[PDB]
Design a protein around this nucleic acid. Sequence first.
RNA 1: UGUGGUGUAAACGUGAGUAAUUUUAUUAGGAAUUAAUGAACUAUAGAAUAAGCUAAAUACUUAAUAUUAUAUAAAAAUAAUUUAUAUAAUAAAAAGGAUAUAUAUAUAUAUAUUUAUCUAUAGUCAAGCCAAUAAUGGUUUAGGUAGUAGGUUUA
RNA 2: CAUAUUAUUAUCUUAUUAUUUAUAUAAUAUUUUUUAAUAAAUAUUAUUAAUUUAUAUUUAUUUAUAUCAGAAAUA
Lengths: 116, 270
Amino acid sequence: TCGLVRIRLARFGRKNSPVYNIVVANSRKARDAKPIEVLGTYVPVPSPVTKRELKRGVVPIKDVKLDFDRTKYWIGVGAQPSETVTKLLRKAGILNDAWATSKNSRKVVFERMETL
Amino acid sequence: GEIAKAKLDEFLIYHKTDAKLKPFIYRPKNAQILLTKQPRPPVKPLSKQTLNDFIYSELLDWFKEWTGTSIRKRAIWTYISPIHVQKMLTASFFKIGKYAHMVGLLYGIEHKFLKAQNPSVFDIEHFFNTNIMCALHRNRLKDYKDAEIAQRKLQVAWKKVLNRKNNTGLANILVATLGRQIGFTPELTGLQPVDISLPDIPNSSSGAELKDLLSKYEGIYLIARTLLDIDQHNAQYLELQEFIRQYQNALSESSDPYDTHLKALGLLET
RNA sequence: UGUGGUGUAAACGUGAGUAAUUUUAUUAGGAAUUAAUGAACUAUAGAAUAAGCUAAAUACUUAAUAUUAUAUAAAAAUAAUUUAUAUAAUAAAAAGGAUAUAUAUAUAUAUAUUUAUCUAUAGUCAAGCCAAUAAUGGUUUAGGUAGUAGGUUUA
RNA sequence: CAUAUUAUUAUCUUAUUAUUUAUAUAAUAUUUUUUAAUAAAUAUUAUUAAUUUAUAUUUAUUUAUAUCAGAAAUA
Ligand SMILES: [Mg+2]
Ligand SMILES: [Mg+2]
Ligand SMILES: [Mg+2]
Ligand SMILES: [Mg+2]
Ligand SMILES: [Mg+2]
Ligand SMILES: [Mg+2]
Ligand SMILES: [Mg+2]
């Protein structure tokens, strides 16, 4: 990543139980220091799905909470997302494929869908 | 004879030394402020004729440690006159007997010479003329007489012509001699015919002036008498004869420059 | 194991000093109205020129080119600030590498695709200074203080 | 009476650094007047290099002030 202002993940939770804040942080401050802003949360463990529900065909859910309007503001003023945050924001529709990379570059089984 | 071997070396050391500590090393009054805080004597601009007779006794080495200097040191590079080029080609072919390595050197170091504002160091009257003069001997001696082999080398030697000046006019007669000796097709873009013009050689000249004409025209005379001897056809022109006869008449003393080189071939041939 | 660039003011650890001369906490506090400062990313623009020095260079030198103070008015958030204009000086830089080709005569050049360099504006992120209130015990420490308290200038 | 640490100075000594006077046939660059070895064309004329000269930038030399830290004394 580059720049003074960066959107990255700050680790919370216990050992073997990671959770994360999506935060706007100064590049120099420690990973778990109090940031400029806490944009959201990210739980890397998918929600368990029952075996019968796997027969049904549900996909396990990875939960992300996020303030979209403020995140777009921080992207706008020049804050630089990390790789994991870049992946998260690309799949939320905030960022487009221009932020993809060569390694990260396929048939769509579902389409990004916004509900109220 | 080693006056050159020491003086050119000191010149090269002086010019290769960084300008930060030239004043403290070479100036006399700064000696005290050097050793307390090796010293060499001053170095003054060096004569072109000083290196002329350095060839008369190594030369490949000297040329390599000489031309490896940085391009932007002008004194080192501009010092080499094309007269030196002719002199060292001649001496290399005849008596030092390492002509091939010298021509390879001069080709690469020509490619380097180009970007030092010294294109004139290669010209007709001091690089090309002697180059093919030695090429004629090269063909004659071992009977290298293939057509394409000689033709391609002629073309390459025409590439290494950084002055397009051809005023004396021996260049075209040399090309004709080469082409007829081998039998190839002398195609030379850029080259043009010129009617020959050589300075008159008076027999009432001052002794210093006599040897000055001698020193200037040693190479052109070698080429002239070579071009005469290699081909009886080249007895056609009397301006080819006037200069040669006047010169060899002025050479009644001591011996010909031509004789020594031609027997210097032999003393290496065995 | 040569010259260079970027990176180590952070993070980590520690609690010696520090009782307030610059420390901490708070405030929807200020001005000196904090600099032709960006540290390092955005968004736009414009540039990227010569020598010297080192073995060479995006290394170092030298040189080229690119807000404030005056004065005129305007107003009012007025006994000053702000605005616009005209000058003065601002007047201060740089850098090239990797690939393609296209010309011509390996040599240059002309384009481009890359990633770099410099400058300007704004935005982010940030810095410097000051005020108010609070911050342990002992007066068996009761007087203390001479830059001390204040004024006027200069640096 | 003895040992230790902290602070202060009309005292002494003082690394370093910053200012501060004054001095250098003191250096390195630019400016002159000259002396040297090269060049070229035909007596040279220009270049590179030393002498003297006067402006910058440094070093050496010192003058003065402040200063880590010691010493002495006092608490
Ligand atoms: Mg990067
Ligand atoms: Mg620190
Ligand atoms: Mg810590
Ligand atoms: Mg403590
Ligand atoms: Mg350069
Ligand atoms: Mg630079
Ligand atoms: Mg005070």
